[PDB]
Amino acid sequence: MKVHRMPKGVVLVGKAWEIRAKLKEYGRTFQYVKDWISKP
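The line above is the sequence of Cell division factor; the predicted structure tokens follow.
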């Protein structure tokens, strides 16, 4: 262990962490249902 799993130093604390979460929760392609219904 020469380095830490989550080290510091050069980091940017802003909304960049929030916008990535919000865009991930909303940007969730729900095709599972469409690919589940098999109707010839």
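Note on the example: Helices lie at 16-26, 32-36. Residues 7 and 33 are 41 Å apart (CA to CA).
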